[PDB]
Amino acid sequence: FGVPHYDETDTFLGPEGEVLVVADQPRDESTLQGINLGATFTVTGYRSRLESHFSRLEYWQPKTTGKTDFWLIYSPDGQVHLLG
Amino acid sequence: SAQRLGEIGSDAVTWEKMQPLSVIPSLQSNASLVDINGDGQLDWVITGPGLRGYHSQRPDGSWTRFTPLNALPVEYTHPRAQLADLMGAGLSDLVLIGPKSVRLYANTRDGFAKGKDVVQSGDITLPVPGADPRKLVAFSDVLGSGQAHLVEVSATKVTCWPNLGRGRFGQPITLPGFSQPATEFNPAQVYLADLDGSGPTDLIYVHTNRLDIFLNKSGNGFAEPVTLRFPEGLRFDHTCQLQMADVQGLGVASLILSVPHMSPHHWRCDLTNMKPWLLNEMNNNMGVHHTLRYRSSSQFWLDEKAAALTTGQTPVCYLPFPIHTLWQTETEDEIS
Amino acid sequence: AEQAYRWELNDDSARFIKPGAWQGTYAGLLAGETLMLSLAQMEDAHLKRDKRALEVERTVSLAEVYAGLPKDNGPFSLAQEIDKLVSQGSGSAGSGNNNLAFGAGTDTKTSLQASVSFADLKIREDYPASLGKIRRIKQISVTLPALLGPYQDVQAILSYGDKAGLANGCEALAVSHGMNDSGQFQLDFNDGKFLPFEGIAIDQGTLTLSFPNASMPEKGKQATMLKTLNDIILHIRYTIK
Amino acid sequence: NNNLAFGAGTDTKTSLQASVSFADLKIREDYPASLGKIRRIKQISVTLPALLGPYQDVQAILSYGDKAGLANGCEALAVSHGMNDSGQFQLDFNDGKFLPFEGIAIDQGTLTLSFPNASMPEKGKQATMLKTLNDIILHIRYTIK
Amino acid sequence: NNNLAFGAGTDTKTSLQASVSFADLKIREDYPASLGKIRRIKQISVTLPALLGPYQDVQAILSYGDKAGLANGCEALAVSHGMNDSGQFQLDFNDGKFLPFEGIAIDQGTLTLSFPNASMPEKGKQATMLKTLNDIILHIRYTIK
Amino acid sequence: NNNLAFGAGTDTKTSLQASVSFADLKIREDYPASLGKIRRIKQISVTLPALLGPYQDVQAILSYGDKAGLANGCEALAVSHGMNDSGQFQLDFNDGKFLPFEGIAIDQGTLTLSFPNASMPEKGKQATMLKTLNDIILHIRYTIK
Amino acid sequence: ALLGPYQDVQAILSYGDKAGLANGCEALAVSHGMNDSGQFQLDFNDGK
Amino acid sequence: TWQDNKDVPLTPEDDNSRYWFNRALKGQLLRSELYGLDDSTNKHVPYTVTEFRSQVRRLQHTDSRYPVLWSSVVESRNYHYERI
């Protein structure tokens, strides 16, 4: 529906081509699997508008300024994927 | 309206005898039929002194009773104001263009957003439509990106300013390959259409008894033009029209010329019989060959409609999109 | 001319023409000259009272007005009440001078009409008193956002039921197509004559708009066109001085 | 004389006003002295690049602060729609009467534009509209002698 | 009286003219005699379907019959755009003066249109413009009395 | 008389001027001598192809370099926008008065078009306007008799 | 939609009881077909 | 709607909701028939009829612009006629 704002109002799509609804409340996290990320990240869970897999997606944002963001996907079969 | 000509399944298409319509939107003045909502319907949009609204042409051949707009820009009717998708929403935004900035009011479907003045960066200077009678200024997807870009066509070159959204444009580039003598060149003779059909819009120049097609190399300039000739007597002048539409349901626009003189006379030119670049053959070199054929969704509609005509039904198409679908395939065994 | 003078200026106290210009004793000699002077005096007064009044265009949504009636008056949706009324040729909506009804006169029993008071429109609130106290109507246009059959027109009469010093025939206006319609085939402000409703005060008086043969049970004509009408729009041009 | 404020008059307190000095606009400097030193206003039109809702009309008046010898009513102009607007239903340069602001030197004086019912918290009406406005544009038609 | 030719006058040899016969046009037979026998031209406009550049003008003069029966200047009409052109910068039926060709009976005489600078070997300018002239359309406004 | 220059007057040094002779426009040659000899200008309109945005005006003046017999003010025309512009806010061929440049023989004298305050080093206001000026088009309405 | 811009209509509209009309007001020329009239210009303020 | 971990029958409110609920089912095969094409009288009956009943369960509806829905075929049939 148009060029993104590159801010919190943007709607994101998951890999299957679908709207990601904030699924849950944000939390902070400084590590991942024990790795010190070097920044505090705010982590928001997401779920696709139309469900068909029930994977959980997370958007991590570098609350501590200086790092970049990233996304994680937690697969129903236990796989974990990191993107961007 | 349009109808299947001949037997159901025939590729032929014709037109129905014009009928008066049972419902007229009224409020004819200061209005036009456009999909302002971007809903897949056309809205008879009226503007003026307390006139802020529309009637809607429903796909079922009926009308929505008058609906007001939530917000109409004062400048909506301003001379030189354009309607174009500059937000990228597929909605036509209202915009005014000067050489260094644009004024845009985003189309929010039910009306327009508070507009903003967008200042262009650097040395980017925008063409201003109407600024120079010798040049054509228009929005077109000359890059084949799915978005219209602002383009200027002169006798010697084509310059284009990429649409970056919200009325912002990128650094202009030159698209070489288009050329006409400066003396002969006249924007009125310049047409834009994706005759190729893959996305980038081709540049077309019309001459009496002939037409030059400059294929658009995906925004990288143009091919040397193919000159086509018109049939004897099909002369072209300033009163003559040129339309481009997929009247044949081939997924490719055909060209139609008309001569209003001595009763309107019309001619069509097809450049194909099939949509270019679709995958239509496959062969594994182990004796198995495949062939694929496609048809516009609009052809299937003509037949759905035709069947209804024989069953006395009045079906409704809810899809104003003449997109190809796969129609037929075959698998051939080279051995047996 | 004296009456025209008074009307234009919103001042009916003015007087220039006096009796006795014609004296029987003197056989009326100089009666003409006497009148010529009075006319010049009138003209002078006109010129010295005139000003370039400001032109204000104010549109009105009837539906908004009816929708907005005080609870006590009983607000309603204009479009909805109309449809009930074309089906019910004996019904009514609204109250006071802000309502819908079929006309009472025999000729009007199948005519659906709406009425509204200027007092409720309260146009005066748009501008400070200090900008001019006299606010009077110049011209009223009508728009009817409804659908029509193939070549069907729409019939209606706009009128002011409070006719007073208003010039003969200026108590009413024809409507045929809407779209900023008027009672003229050609609207011309330099016609030299007064336009319908011209000189009516902004603060008071009642207008009505009548659609003949709006009763559906009687198989009328407007009944089916009214069915598709979502609002009534007035375009009221008035001036301030 | 180049500012924004609400009007001081009792029934103008909720009217938002904007004002500008013609001297500060320096229109005069746009043309050479040799073309003549008499540069005066013939007419002013007004454009208001805002958005209007279904029945939202513009309530605004443009006026010259000092009547300065003008004929009655020439001190001001109404605005109703905002696109190259004017104070009269028909603009006619051959009308025969003087137009609003006609004869004012472009050289000086303060012009003001009034917007009644602009105060939002006091239940304004134009106030909603005014928020959608991006600029104020004047079209000053003047002549040189 | 239905032909094309280059003119024979001193300054007409590079000018190509076309001409037609009113008698052959037979406009008269379009309506019944019972309507009145008098049918006369009020005005003539010209359309010249052709392809001209943004600033390329048409050079052509329309003229008729024996000028002796006409008011001065009514013997001819200028053509410049070929777009329902009249020979006037402004067409006005209430002008008070006779229009070009006004009062000519539709029944007779020869009408002609002349294009100067039409000889290609002489480097005429109309000479190349005319390669795209598809037709000459006359629009005749006439009336029955 | 076919050149460009900055003006030499005291208030013109920042004014870019264009000058053209009438004689070299060779208008006369468009039509046969036998068509008429008195060929004089009735009205001139001006187009200045340039990137003038929605509210961007242009200050430009066209004048006759040999005022002689012209009524006061007919020596010049003021361009405000450059799109078939003209010498008045309302054009009316029935105005009752003579138009700018009216009566000038089509091949005599010279015209000059000024662009005031346009020199870039001087921060002329129009300097950026001229950067986009791609031509100067004159539209001359004249008559033959 | 009967005709295009370069085709003409030859037709006459007339009223039977012409007795009360001024000479020529008994009929209307038809030649255009689009809200036309029997005159080249229409002006309701015309003195005739 | 999913409530207290129960599959609860729902009348889908207004048009906004109805839209998302119906949207969730797009592309779902609802019926399929296999019909022979020959000159026998059996050409007037299918060999088989397959039917599906789809459902949509509402799971989340915080950001109401894009409600989270899940869908599947709740039930299906297979009729065998053999053109009888």
Q: Which residues pair with B301 in a beta bridge?
A: none
Q: F89 in helix, strand or coil?
A: coil
**B79 in contact with D, Cβ within 8 Å:** no
Spatial contact of E14 and E122, defined as CB atoms under 8 Å apart: yes
CA–CA separation, C144 and C139 (whole Å) = 17
CA–CA separation, E41 and B6 (whole Å) = 50
Pairing of strands E83-85, E39-47: antiparallel
> What secondary structure letter does DSSP report for B99?
S
- Cα dihedral across residues G32, E33, E47, F93: positive or negative: negative
Cβ pair B237:E134 closer than 8 A: yes
CA–CA separation, B89 and B166 (whole Å) = 10
Q: Tell me if there are at least 3 CB pairs under 8 Å linking chains G and H.
A: no
CB contacts of B63 in chain C (<8 Å) are 147
Closest to F116 (Cβ–Cβ): which among D32, D94, D144?
D32
**E121 in contact with B, Cβ within 8 Å:** no
CA–CA separation, C209 and C160 (whole Å) = 9
Length of chain F: 145
- The residues, ordered by sequence, that sit 6+ positions from B310 with a Cβ below 8 Å of its Cβ are none
CA–CA separation, H34 and H23 (whole Å) = 27
Q: Which of A10, A11, A21 to mutate against chain H (most H CBs within 10 Å)?
A: A21
Closest to A23 (Cβ–Cβ): which among H24, H60, H71?
H60
Spatial contact of D50 and B71, defined as CB atoms under 8 Å apart: no
- Cα dihedral across residues D121, D123, D124, D127: positive or negative: positive
**B199 in contact with F, Cβ within 8 Å:** no
Cβ pair F53:B96 closer than 8 A: yes
Closest to F51 (Cβ–Cβ): which among B96, B103, B128?
B128
Spatial contact of D140 and D41, defined as CB atoms under 8 Å apart: yes
CA–CA separation, B12 and B4 (whole Å) = 6
F33 φ, ψ to 5°? -65, -30
Closest chain D C-alpha to F61 CA, distance in angstroms:
9
Q: Which chains touch C (3 or more CB pairs under 8 A)?
A: B, D, G
CA–CA separation, B253 and B272 (whole Å) = 9
The counts of H helices and E strands in chain B are 1, 27
Closest chain C C-alpha to G41 CA, distance in angstroms:
14
Cβ pair F54:B78 closer than 8 A: yes
CA–CA separation, E121 and G36 (whole Å) = 48
**B235 in contact with E, Cβ within 8 Å:** yes
Closest chain A C-alpha to B101 CA, distance in angstroms:
19
CA Rg, chain E, in Å? 16
Spatial contact of F31 and E125, defined as CB atoms under 8 Å apart: no
CA–CA separation, C26 and B38 (whole Å) = 85
CA–CA separation, D79 and F145 (whole Å) = 49
Q: Which of F132, F133, F138 to mutate against chain B (most B CBs within 10 Å)?
A: F132
Pick the residue from chain G with its C-alpha nearest to C191.
Answer: G45
Pairing of strands A50-51, H68-80: parallel
Q: Which of C47, C50, C54 to mutate against chain D (most D CBs within 10 Å)?
A: C54
CA–CA separation, A51 and B6 (whole Å) = 47
Spatial contact of F61 and D36, defined as CB atoms under 8 Å apart: no
Q: Which residues pair with D44 in a beta bridge?
A: D140
CA–CA separation, B28 and B21 (whole Å) = 14
F69 φ, ψ to 5°? 95, -10
Residue C221 Rama label (left phi>0; alpha psi -120 to 50; beta) = alpha
CA–CA separation, A26 and A60 (whole Å) = 10
**B80 in contact with F, Cβ within 8 Å:** yes
**Residue of B106, G43, H58 whose CA lies nearest to E94:** G43
Closest chain G C-alpha to E143 CA, distance in angstroms:
9
Residue window 55-74, chain H: list those with CB within 8 Å of chain A.
Answer: 59-60, 62-63, 66-71
Q: Which helix (H) or strand (E) holds C166?
A: none
**F135 in contact with B, Cβ within 8 Å:** yes
**Residue of G41, G13, G34, G33 whose CA lies nearest to G25:** G13
Closest chain A C-alpha to H5 CA, distance in angstroms:
16
CA–CA separation, G30 and G8 (whole Å) = 9
Pick the residue from chain F with its C-alpha nearest to B125.
Answer: F51
CA E91 to the chain's CA centroid: 16
Q: Is B129 exposed, middle or buried (0-12, 13-18, 19+ CB in 10 A)?
A: middle
Q: Which of C186, C190, C193 to mutate against chain G (most G CBs within 10 Å)?
A: C186
Length of chain H: 84
CA–CA separation, C162 and C31 (whole Å) = 38
What does the block give as tokens for C148? 């029509």
A79 φ, ψ to 5°? -75, 150
H42 φ, ψ to 5°? -80, -5
Cβ pair C52:D72 closer than 8 A: yes
Please name the residue that has the structure tokens 């298409």. B13
Spatial contact of F84 and F2, defined as CB atoms under 8 Å apart: no
Chain A residues with CB under 8 Å of a chain H CB are: 19, 21-23, 47-52
CA–CA separation, E95 and E98 (whole Å) = 8
CB contacts of G6 in chain E (<8 Å) are 137
CA–CA separation, C126 and B266 (whole Å) = 57
- The residues, ordered by sequence, that sit 6+ positions from E125 with a Cβ below 8 Å of its Cβ are E59, E117
Q: Which chains touch A (3 or more CB pairs under 8 A)?
A: B, H
Closest chain B C-alpha to E129 CA, distance in angstroms:
10
- Helical axes C31-49 vs C2-9, angle rounded to 10°: 10
Closest chain B C-alpha to E46 CA, distance in angstroms:
13
- Identify how the structure was determined: cryo-EM
- The residues, ordered by sequence, that sit 6+ positions from C158 with a Cβ below 8 Å of its Cβ are C140, C142, C172, C173, C174, C175, C183, C196, C207, C208, C209, C210
Which residue type is seen at D30? Answer: D
Q: Which of D51, D55, D58, D132 to mutate against chain B (most B CBs within 10 Å)?
A: D51
Q: B293 in helix, strand or coil?
A: strand
Spatial contact of D137 and D46, defined as CB atoms under 8 Å apart: yes
∠ CA H51-H56-H59, nearest 5°, is 160
- Cα dihedral across residues H60, H62, H64, H65: positive or negative: negative
Q: Which residues pair with B168 in a beta bridge?
A: B165
Which residue type is seen at H4? Answer: D
CA–CA separation, C8 and B331 (whole Å) = 90
Closest to G10 (Cβ–Cβ): which among E31, E93, E143?
E31
Q: B108 in helix, strand or coil?
A: coil
Strands (E), chain E: 3-6, 16-21, 39-47, 60-64, 76-79, 83-85, 110-115, 137-144
Resolution of this structure in Å = 4.0
